[PDB]
Curated annotation (Swiss-Prot):
Family per record: Belongs to the FAD-dependent oxidoreductase family.
Lineage top rank: taxon: Bacteria
Name assigned to this protein: Putidaredoxin reductase CamA
Function: The oxidation of camphor by cytochrome P450-CAM CamC requires the participation of the flavoprotein, putidaredoxin reductase CamA, and the iron-sulfur protein, putidaredoxin CamB, to mediate the transfer of electrons from NADH to P450 for oxygen activation.
Gene3D superfamilies reported for this sequence: 3.30.390.30, FAD/NAD(P)-binding domain
A GO CC annotation given for this chain: cytoplasm
Top class in the EC scheme: oxidoreductase
């Protein structure tokens, strides 16, 4: 609006993508990015992959080159923590006491690592006990990915698995602990969890499921972890401990500002929070999925880009793209893993291919409806799966597992059934 000033809280992929999106959709007003992080906004996925492997330059991580902020006239204010929002005056209050005025406010606060209770005090503070979320976290762990050293990963989520895969490649003695009965218990089917556990075990990782960490042993001098103790009494000697038991959405700001909060900042079809002038986006945002007809909060890059762009369109009086099936990816041992949709509430699963090799797709179904698909080294079936989920195609369930029948044809028939037959 040439006059309307927009303020974005959070310099993560979400906030940065909103900033450049805005200026790309023809926003002439001023754009301010305020983030507590001091570093240059960078990519996160590399931190448990190539960067964690020391095979990518720090420079390749930048979301956008520093010149780009200048060129696009985007003001970046780092190392600054926003402590409050005054919806009334329409201001943002910094930790130094300063205040910024806004006509439009975007909350791209992401989330923070969920603290491991038995790791409070000295444990957490140790140089060899880290969580993985910041550039600093990554480099600190990378400096310690040492051959023959012993690593204990506490947490069996995708990042946990990606870390274990990188540490293994680095020839460390790796042990991964999960309280769940099987890795990725909540988001995949048993046979899928079996694939990962065998993949990693085969690779050398010792996975201990249904295992709980009661505490740690430490050295009095260095104040470093020396071992991980399990509830069952097992002692795991450790040189490095990487904890990851989930993410906590940063909602405090909206919470104290009277905005609706529920395991994330609540937004409507227009990305608006309880307050019309305030929008939320990214890992922090809880929105309604019309595709699944329920409130969700996605923590993924594609989710950030989709939401970010939508916000830019709206604020620029443009029309937002139609909701797209959610998806994300994971890279482990060079295996291309891509997942689309949300598997919650599935009745059965159908495996298209053999689970005895990284080359198959797993369709998650609730009745005859396909909820999600996890593909392993199948980029084309993944793209085709996107279509099915998004457009709710009536693909024939009994043909999904049959590999003699191309997925393209199964889809073609489903679309044909939609046209000529009621
Ligand atoms: C190691 C790792 C690997 C990943 N790999 C993948 C992957 O392979 N594929 C995929 O799809 N996704 C992956 N993700 C997730 C993906 O990176 C994120 O979902 C995406 O980048 C969106 O992040 P965000 O910007 O919403 O939140 P964040 O990246 O957390 O950004 C929010 C920023 O706002 C700051 N902030 C919060 N409150 C305030 C405040 N009051 N004042 C100032 N600043 C504040 C936060 O400190 C933070 O810097 C990975 C994440 C990690 C950590």
């Amino acid at each position: 609006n040439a006059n309307d000033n927009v303020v974005i809280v959070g310099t993560g992929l979400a906030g940065v993508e909103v900033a450049f999106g805005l200026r790309a959709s023809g926003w002439e007003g001023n754009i301010r990015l305020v983030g507590d992080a001091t570093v240059i906004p960078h990519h996160l996925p590399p931190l448990s992959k190539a960067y964690l492997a020391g095979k990518a330059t720090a420079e390749s991580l930048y979301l956008r080159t520093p010149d780009a902020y200048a060129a696009q006239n985007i003001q970046l204010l780092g190392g600054t923590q926003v402590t409050a929002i005054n919806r009334d005056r329409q201001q943002v209050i910094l930790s130094d006491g300063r205040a910024l005025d806004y006509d439009r406010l975007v909350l791209a606060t992401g989330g923070r690592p969920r603290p491991l209770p038995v790791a409070s005090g000295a444990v957490g503070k140790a140089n060899n006990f880290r969580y993985l979320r910041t550039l600093e976290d990554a480099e600190c762990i990378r400096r310690q990915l040492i051959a023959d050293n012993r690593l204990v990963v506490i947490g069996g989520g995708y990042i946990g698995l990606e870390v274990a895969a990188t540490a293994i490649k680095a020839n460390m003695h790796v042990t991964l602990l999960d309280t769940a009965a099987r890795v990725l218990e909540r988001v995949t089917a048993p046979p899928v969890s079996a694939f990962y556990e065998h993949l990693h075990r085969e690779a050398g990782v010792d996975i201990r499921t249904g295992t709980q960490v009661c505490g740690f042993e430490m050295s009095t001098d260095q104040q470093k972890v020396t071992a991980v103790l399990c509830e069952d009494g097992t002692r795991l000697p450790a040189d490095l401990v990487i904890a990851g038991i989930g993410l906590i959405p940063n909602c405090e700001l909206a919470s104290a500002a009277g905005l609706q909060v529920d395991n994330g900042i609540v937004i409507n079809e227009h990305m608006q929070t309880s307050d019309p002038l305030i929008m939320a986006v990214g890992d922090c945002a809880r929105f309604h999925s019309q595709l699944y007809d329920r409130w969700v909060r996605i923590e993924s890059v594609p989710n950030a880009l989709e939401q970010a762009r939508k916000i830019a369109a709206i604020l620029c009086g443009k029309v937002p793209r139609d909701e797209a099936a959610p998806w994300f990816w994971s890279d482990q041992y060079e295996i291309g893993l891509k997942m689309v949709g949300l598997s919650e509430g599935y009745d059965r699963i159908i495996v298209r291919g053999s689970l005895a090799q990284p080359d198959f797709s797993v369709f998650y179904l609730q009745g005859d409806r396909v909820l999600a698909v996890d593909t392993v080294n199948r980029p084309v079936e993944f793209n085709q799966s996107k279509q099915i989920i998004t457009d709710r195609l009536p693909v024939e369930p009994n043909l999904l597992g049959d590999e003699s029948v191309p997925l393209k044809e199964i889809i073609a028939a489903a679309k044909a059934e939609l046209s000529s037959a009621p």
